[PDB]
């Protein structure tokens, strides 16, 4: 069951979906039979051994709301092979043609699905380290899956990529002191909730990374997004407690969001955008 390293010749890279900071994502075909996504890593951006050791852990994480790792090509340039998610990143989906039609019920259901995957990560005593809408994938029927879990711990710049960090999504104890835990992921999830309720806008509008760190450190928190109910902003603010142990669990977040329109905001009615 550990024989998941594959020869590069077993993959056809057929359609380039986009370019990231560290490589490319392709739609392709594996073993002549299977539709896959292929994520490529420029040489020198990740230690092959360290990747394989982490991949052994990641291959064990199996949940309907986590993207499934199928295979790796372990020679530089490293290729990661996963299931194909037909609507791409949640961030692109929110910002695309469909995004303008999403209302609060769809966005809260998407949040509940992300919370369910993260509750699994929580049960497995694992840590994502880079939770944000860019690292959620969307399929048919608004299925959302958590992607890119664990990788941030291993990613480095090469000479090229160095000429180009998600501070705005990162809990202060993680950004400042390297204290990455499930509770720093909960902070990230709170920021992700702002991405959902603004249909993809960058957090802390008008602020650069240094201003965000300065302001958050002195107690600043984002205010309630336009048309967002106060009750959902209150949940965001629980995720952004200074004391990490006082932030909610993903188990709690999942339950709150699943039950939201019955228990919390039954008075919901559609407005201009939500
Ligand atoms: C094949 O490996 C992955 C693929 C994807 C993925 N990313 N994307 C979106 C590509 N998108 C990035 C945004 C860009 N815009 C900014 C212009 C346009 C292109 C996918 N789309 C459909 N299926 C996928 N599977 C992926 C996301 C993550 C991974 N890898 C991964 O999660 O690795 C582990 C499972 C090991 C954590």
List the keywords.
274 residues; alpha+beta; Phosphorylase Kinase, domain 1; Transferase(Phosphotransferase), domain 1; 5-stranded antiparallel sheet; two-stranded antiparallel sheet; 14% strand; binds ligand UCW; signaling protein; Src kinase; inhibitor complex; inactive kinase
Note the topology.
Layout: E1 11-19, E2 24-30, E3 34-40, H1 48-60, E4 69-73, E5 79-82, H2 90-95, H3 104-123, E6 136-138, E7 144-146, H4 172-177, H5 182-197, H6 209-217, H7 230-239, H8 250-258, H9 260-263
Antiparallel strand pairs: 1-2, 2-3, 3-5, 4-5, 6-7
Helix pairs in contact: 3-5, 3-8, 5-7
The chain binds the ligand COc1cc(-c2nn(CCN3CCC(N(C)C)CC3)c3ncnc(N)c23)ccc1NC(=O)OC(C)(C)C.
What does this structure look like?
The chain has 274 residues and is an alpha+beta fold. It folds into two domains: 8-83, Phosphorylase Kinase, domain 1, CATH 3.30.200; 88-264, Transferase(Phosphotransferase), domain 1 (Orthogonal Bundle), CATH 1.10.510. The chain contains nine helices and seven strands. The protein has helices at residues 48-60, 90-95, 104-123, 172-177, 182-197, 209-217, 230-239, 250-258, 260-263; strands spanning 11-19, 24-30, 34-40, 69-73, 79-82, 136-138, 144-146. The strands form two sheets. The protein has a five-stranded antiparallel β-sheet with strand order 1-2-3-5-4, with helices on one face. α3 runs antiparallel to α5 (182-197), α3 runs antiparallel to α8 (250-258) and α5 packs antiparallel against α7. The longest helix is centred in the middle third of the chain and has 20 residues, at 104-123. The chain is globular, with a radius of gyration of 19 Å. Its main location: membrane.
